[PDB]
């Protein structure tokens, strides 16, 4: 995985805050996932911030809001600067010991989770793009006007990108909309049977399922049960689709023994009945599904039991989407941020090399 520094601008650190990143002139956070926050509240970083006072953390407005709902990251409050989306922003990078560098940064939406962005950096050592984690459908990058200069793509020296599914096996993944529609109709078909029919959405403990919860809630007139919603206190379009009350037909609550509970007709939050009538529960597990280059799309819903389902859902681009994105960017260099499970860095680097100028 990416270790925080791009070769072209080593004085900035993105999505990694330990080790060599303790000497950054500026920090950037693409989104609030733990794997991109390593060292972000380490005592050594706090120590370092107390002496170096012109060092800031930059992120999207939503990332700022989410980060600071955690008590443990509140110390960042005085040093966090949000940057508006697709608003090129001049940043000064001071050597605390004479040097001054200026860069321009533009935040582009990444489609990965609330607040998730890509960072385009422009300065006197070339233009580089750090994608963070992204899921962009074919055509979306071409519509981003700030990736372009006079009708063609900007000259991009290096792209540091999300290669989670950068393997030909993961050729195509169903779109966001297809995934949502499949889950929507499954839930609708169940919870309209009676008030005692309920769904458990078995989700990972991470941001990124909120557009699923909001659309289910908006379309079906039901709030989704969650463990904690205080991070969305100041986010009305998300907040009002969620609830901490157990008395609802859609649940996205969690705990360590949640899957055992479901096998005994119990939701994670412990509700098993209403008016002493047993709830009729189905489980739906958002899970990445894909199809090969020479294959056809199949159902986004996969039944795994009498009462259990998997539902296509992806946080990251498919291989065909990565290739399309990088082909379009046509950078000099492309560096993988992520080595997939059963592959190597050489395999990934060489997959992408044909799309690059060097
Ligand atoms: Zn992520
Ligand atoms: Zn990640
Ligand atoms: Zn619940």
Interacting residues of 193 by C-beta distance below 8 A, sequence separation 6+: 280
Cβ partners under 8 Å of residue 61, min gap 6: 82, 84, 85, 115
DSSP type of residue 260? H
Query: What resolution in angstroms does the PDB record give?
Result: 1.7
Verify that 23 and 136 share a domain, yes or no. Answer: yes
Q: What spacing in Å lies between the alpha carbon of 18 and ligand 1's midpoint? A: 18
* Rg of the chain (C-alpha set): 22
Q: Report the C-alpha gap between 132 and 349 in whole angstroms.
A: 17
d(CA 250, CA 199): 5
355: left (phi over 0), alpha (psi -120 to 50) or beta: alpha
- Same-domain status, 225 and 190: yes
Asked if 59 and 28 count as a contact pair (C-beta separation under 8 A), the reply is yes
The answer to whether the CB of 173 falls within 8 A of the CB of 322 is no
Q: 38: Cβ–Cβ under 8 A, 6 or more apart, which residues?
A: 16, 17, 18
| Boundaries of domain holding 52 | 1-170+317-358
* Both tokens assigned to 111: 């489609």
Distance 331 CA to ligand 2 centre (A): 22
Q: Which ligand is nearest to the CA of 1?
A: 2
Residue located via tokens 């901490």: 244
Query: Both 310 and 348 in a single domain?
Result: no
Nearest ligand to the CA atom of 31: 1
The encoded tokens of residue 156 equal 């991009």
- For residues 233 and 47, give the distance between their C-alpha atoms in angstroms, rounded to a whole number: 30
For residues 40 and 17, the answer to whether their CB atoms sit within 8 Å is: yes
- How many domains, in total, are found in the chain? 2
Ligand 2: distance of its center to the CA of 266 in Å? 31
Long-range interactions of 148-153: CB distance < 8 A, separation 24+: 153/328, 153/329, 153/330
End-to-end distance of the chain based on CA atoms, in angstroms? 22
Q: What are residue 128's DSSP bridge partners? A: 121, 158
Q: Smallest Cα–Cα separation from 74: which of 49, 91, 94?
A: 49
Q: Distance from the CA of 85 to the center of ligand 2, in angstroms?
A: 20
3-class state of residue 190 by DSSP:
helix
| 331 and 215 within one domain | no
The position carrying tokens 């029919």 is 197
Three-class DSSP category at 204: coil
With beta carbons less than 8 A apart as the criterion, state whether 283 and 307 touch: yes
Give bridge partners of residue 158 from the DSSP assignment.
128, 333
Give yes or no for a contact between 196 and 164, defined as CB atoms under 8 angstroms apart. Answer: no
Q: How far apart are CA 79 and CA 293, in angstroms?
A: 47
In whole angstroms, give the CA distance from residue 316 to residue 297.
Answer: 18
Tokens describing residue 49? 């911030």
Q: Helix (H, G, I), strand (E, B), or coil: what is residue 291?
A: strand
Q: Could you tell me if 349 and 237 lie in one domain?
A: no
Q: Give DSSP secondary structure letters for 263-275.
A: HTT--TT---EET
For residue 292, give both structure tokens.
Answer: 């090969």
Phi, psi torsion values for 264, nearest 5 degrees: -105, 30
**140 and 134 Cβ atoms separated by less than 8 Å:** no
| Ligand number nearest to the C-alpha of 111 | 1
Helices (H), the chain: 43-51, 61-67, 176-191, 210-220, 236-239, 258-263, 319-329, 345-352
| Total count of residues recorded for the chain | 358
**Sign of the C-alpha dihedral computed for residues 178, 183, 184 and 185 taken in this order:** positive
- Looking at the structure, tell me whether residues 236 and 293 fall in a common domain: yes
| Ligand at shortest distance from the CA of 135 | 1
Are 332 and 127 spatial neighbours (Cβ–Cβ below 8 Å)?
no
Q: In this structure, are residues 61 and 82 in contact, taking their beta carbons and an 8 Å threshold?
A: yes
- Which tokens hold the place of 230? 């205080």
Do 276 and 240 lie in one domain? The reply is yes
Ligand nearest to the CA of 255: 3
Nearest one of 18, 24, 23, 67 to 39, comparing CA atoms: 18
Do 243 and 338 lie in one domain? The reply is no
What is the DSSP track for 153-164? Answer: E---SEEEE--T
Same domain, 258 and 312: yes
Strand partners, 285: 310
How many angstroms separate the alpha carbon of residue 42 from the centre of ligand 2?
19
Among 96, 125, 91, 124, which residue's Cα sits nearest to residue 107? 91
Pairing of strands 126-130, 158-161: parallel
Question: Residues near 354 by Cβ (< 8 Å), separated by ≥ 6?
Answer: none
What is the distance in A from the centroid of ligand 2 to the CA of 35?
Answer: 6
Per-residue three-class SS string for 79-103: HEEECCCCCCEEEEEECCCCCEEEE
In the PDB record, what is the listed experimental method? X-ray
Please report how the helices 319-329 and 345-352 are oriented relative to each other, as an axis angle in degrees rounded to 10: 50
Do 7 and 149 lie in a common domain? yes
Q: Using CA atoms, how far apart are residues 314 and 8, in angstroms rounded to an integer?
A: 31
What residues contact 232, with CB distance under 8 A and at least 6 apart? Answer: 210, 238, 239, 242
276's CB contacts (< 8 A; 6+ apart) are none
- Are 129 and 184 found together in one domain? no
Ligand closest to CA 247: 3
Task: Say which ligand is closest to the CA of 110.
Answer: 1
Scanning the structure block, which residue is given the tokens 């733990």? Answer: 34
Cα 118 from Cα 329, distance rounded (Å): 13
Ligand nearest to C-alpha 112: 1
At residue 20, φ and ψ (nearest 5 deg) are: -65, -25
Q: How far is CA 74 from CA 16, 68, 317, in A?
A: 18, 5, 32
Q: How far is the CA of 49 from the centre of ligand 2 (A)?
A: 25
Same domain, residue pair 211 and 138? no
For CA atoms 139, 177, 32, 70, give the dihedral sign: positive
- Of 152, 131, 149, the C-alpha closest to 36 is 131
């Amino acid at each position: 995985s990416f270790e925080g520094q791009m070769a072209e601008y080593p004085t900035i650190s993105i999505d990694r805050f330990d080790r060599e990143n303790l000497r950054a002139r500026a920090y950037f956070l693409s989104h609030c996932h733990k794997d991109h926050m390593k060292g972000l509240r380490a005592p050594t970083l706090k120590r370092r911030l107390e002496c170096s006072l012109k060092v800031y953390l930059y992120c999207s407005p939503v990332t700022k809001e989410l980060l600071l709902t955690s008590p443990k990251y509140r110390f960042w409050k005085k040093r966090i600067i949000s940057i508006e989306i697709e608003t090129p922003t001049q940043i000064s990078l001071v050597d605390e010991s004479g040097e001054k560098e200026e860069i321009v940064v533009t935040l582009l939406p990444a489609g990965h989770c609330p607040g998730s962005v890509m960072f385009l950096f422009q300065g006197n050592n070339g233009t580089v793009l750090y994608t963070g984690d992204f899921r962009l459908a074919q055509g979306e990058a071409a519509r981003m006007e700030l990736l372009h200069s006079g009708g063609r793509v900007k000259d991009i020296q290096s792209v540091y990108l999300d290669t989670t599914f950068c393997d030909p096996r993961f050729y195509q993944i169903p779109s966001r909309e297809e995934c949502l529609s499949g889950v929507l109709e499954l839930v609708r078909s169940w919870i309209t049977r009676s008030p005692y029919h309920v769904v458990w959405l078995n989700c990972k403990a991470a941001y990124g399922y909120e557009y699923l919860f909001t659309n289910l809630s908006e379309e079906l007139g039901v709030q989704v049960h969650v463990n904690k919603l205080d991070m969305f206190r100041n986010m009305p379009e998300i907040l009002h689709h969620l609830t901490t009350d157990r008395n609802t037909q859609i649940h996205a609550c969690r705990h360590p023994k949640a899957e055992e509970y479901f096998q005994w007709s119990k939701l994670p939050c412990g509700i098993t009945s209403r008016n002493r009538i047993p709830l009729h529960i189905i489980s739906i597990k958002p899970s990445t599904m894909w199809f090969g280059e020479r294959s056809r799309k199949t159902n986004v819903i996969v039944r795994t039991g009498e009462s259990s389902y998997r539902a296509c859902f992806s946080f990251h681009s498919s291989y065909s989407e990565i290739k399309d994105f990088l082909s379009y960017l046509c950078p000099v260099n492309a560096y993988p941020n992520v080595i997939p499970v059963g592959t190597t860095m050489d395999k990934v680097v060489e997959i992408l090399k044909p799309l690059c100028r060097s």
